[PDB]
Structures are given as C-alpha cells and as structure tokens.
Amino acid sequence: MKYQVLTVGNPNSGKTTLFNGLTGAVTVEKKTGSFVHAGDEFSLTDLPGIYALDSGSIDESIASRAVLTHPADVIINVVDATCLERSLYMTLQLRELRRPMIVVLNKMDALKRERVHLDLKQLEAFLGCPVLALSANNKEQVRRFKEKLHKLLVQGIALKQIELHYGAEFESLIHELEPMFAEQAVSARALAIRALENDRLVINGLKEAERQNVEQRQHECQVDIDLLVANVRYTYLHELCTHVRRTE
Ligand SMILES: Nc1nc2c(ncn2[C@@H]2O[C@H](COP(=O)(O)OP(=O)(O)O)[C@@H](O)[C@H]2O)c(=O)[nH]1
Ligand SMILES: [Mg+2]
C-alpha cells in the first residue's frame, strides 16, 4: 500500500532536517522523496515553511495550495518545541481542517537543555491528535520514528476537533456557510471560517452567487472578523501554553 505524507511546519523547525533523516541526504522548495518500510511505500512531500495556511510570499500560496487540495494519508506537523506558543498557531489552523494529523515536536534535545519539560499528554488532550516529541538530528530517534509513523498510518489516526468556539455571533455565521462546503475535501467549518476571513484562495471555488452570500455575511459580523478570530485563538493558545509548559 502507498501513503502520501505531507510534512508541513513552521520555518526553521527542523522540517528539512527530518526529511533528509527519513529518505536520504520542480523549482520551488517543494522537495519530494520516497522511502519504503515493511512492504509499504511512502511519498514524502516537503511543504515550504509557512506560519499560516493563508496567502502571503508566493511560496506561502504554493504551500497553502497543497495543504488544501493534495491527497494526504497523513499530515506530519513539524513544530519546534523551543518556541511552542508561536508554532501552535499553524497547528491550530491545521486541526480545523480535520485532516489526519500528527504534531511532531522537534529540538527536544535543545528543549531539554533549557530545563523546559512539557506535559505532552495534557497537550495531546487539548489538540486531539498524536503528539510525538523527538530530536531530528538524533538519528536513533528518527529510526524509531519511522516505525512510529508506519504503525500510526496502518491503524489510522483518531481525531477530536479543537474546542474553538468563536462567540455565538460567529458560530451563527459559520453554520450558515457550512452548507456550501459540506462535501468538500476538508472540514466544511474551516472553509466557512476562511471564507469569512475572506481568503482569496477559498472564494475562487465559489460562484458569484456564493461569493456575494459570503460577502453579505462579512458585513454581519459587526466586530472586526480578523481581530475576533485571533482573540479567540489567543484565548485558547495561552491557556494551553500555561498548562503544558514547565520551566525550571
Ligand atoms: N538543537 C537541535 N537543532 C535542530 C534539531 N532539529 C533541527 N535543528 C536545527 O534546525 C536547523 C534548520 O532546520 P531546517 O532543516 O532548515 O528546517 P526548515 O527550515 O523548516 O526546512 C538546522 O540547521 C538544525 O541545526 C534538534 O533536534 N535539535
Ligand atoms: Mg475584513
């Protein structure tokens, strides 16, 4: 059997380091490669470093493209453990999609020297997805991680969405626009949210009728949408990074 695997992650979180650790040492930095383990093939794509699933540089749009449309049997989220409260922002955006997800915490060797120990399971409950801590430069933990991934892929990932409620005013707006994306390849909720935030990427697949139905909905949120969404996301991220984080 074959497995499409997308390693998306924050820039300088060790994403290319891990890619070369697993496989081996089209213009843009979309580096693909295959390895095999126990009779099952993998197709690893290195999605360029991004902080958000929205649009920016060009590489941003490039990476955002494959996040939403590529067939991916699993999405490995490469997150640097040293700076968690930033890197969890994109991890927060990825869980909304309901795509098969892992949170691979990297630089655990460097995090360990900081006297920062993390409640990886209290973190795991907040996110509702497997959280795997490792050092990518330690190729013993990479050899073991190959087995960790292959078992996860075969059994499937059990996922619970993240309890982000954005205020009942926004939730009413979301539940009106979810009909449009009910079938879609990712969560209808995330696409309705990203349409309310007015992502040009999302609106492209919307007709004039649907575009101007969403355009209506934006002027219904009498509080600034972009400001509101970040406020709720900070609310969740901060109460997360206080609970799971121990420093000595
Ligand atoms: N101390 C430490 N440094 C790491 C670890 N993993 C990656 N790095 C560093 O992260 C740097 C950049 O990673 P890179 O492969 O460029 O990731 P990308 O920028 O997301 O593609 C490398 O030069 C490594 O030195 C780790 O486990 N421990
Ligand atoms: Mg606006």
Numbering used by the authors: 1 to 25, 35 to 65, 70 to 261
Give the exact sentences the study uses for this entry:
For this bacterium, Feo is the primary system that transports Fe2+ into the cytosol. FeoA and FeoC are known to be small (ca. 7–10 kDa) cytosolic proteins, while FeoB is a large (ca. 80–100 kDa) polytopic transmembrane protein that contains an N-terminal soluble G-protein-like domain termed NFeoB. The status of GTP and GDP bound to the NFeoB region is hypothesized to control the opening and closing of the FeoB pore and therefore the translocation of Fe2+ into the bacterial cytosol.
Despite extensive fine screening and testing of multiple conditions, we were only able to generate datasets of GDP-bound VcNFeoB(His)6 that diffracted modestly, but completely, to 4.2 Å resolution in the C121 space group consistent with 4 molecules in the asymmetric unit (ASU). Using molecular replacement with our 2.3 Å apo VcNFeoB structure coupled with strongly restrained refinement approaches, we built a model that clearly displayed GDP in the nucleotide-binding pocket of all molecules in the ASU based on omit maps. The crystal structure of VcNFeoB(His)6 bound to GDP reveals multiple amino acids that contribute to nucleotide binding. In the absence of nucleotide, the binding pocket is fairly open, while binding of GDP elicits a contraction surrounding the nucleobase with the associated amino acids responsible for nucleotide recognition coming together. In this structure, the Switch I loop that is important for GTP hydrolysis is mostly disordered, which may be attributed to the flexibility of this region when GDP is bound. As the nucleobase enters the binding pocket, a region of random coil from Asn119 to Asp122 tightens, and both residues (conserved amongst NFeoBs) become within hydrogen-bonding distance (3.5 and 2.8 Å, respectively) of the guanine purine. Underneath the guanine purine is Lys120, also conserved in many NFeoBs, which appears to prop up the hydrolyzed nucleotide in the binding pocket; electrostatic contributions from this residue are not observed in our structure, and in some NFeoBs (like those in S. thermophilus, K. pneumoniae, E. coli and Gallionella capsiferriformans, and Thermotoga maritima) this residue corresponds to a non-polar amino acid, either a Met or an Ala. Interestingly, Asn150 is positioned along a region of random coil (known as the G5 motif) above the guanine purine but turned towards, and tightly hydrogen bonded with Asp122 on the G4 motif (2.3 Å distance). While the general NFeoB G-protein-like fold is conserved in our structures, the GDP-bound WT VcNFeoB(His)6 structure revealed interactions between Asn150 (G5 motif) and Asp122 (G4 motif) that caused Asp122 to decrease the number of interactions it makes with the guanine nucleobase.
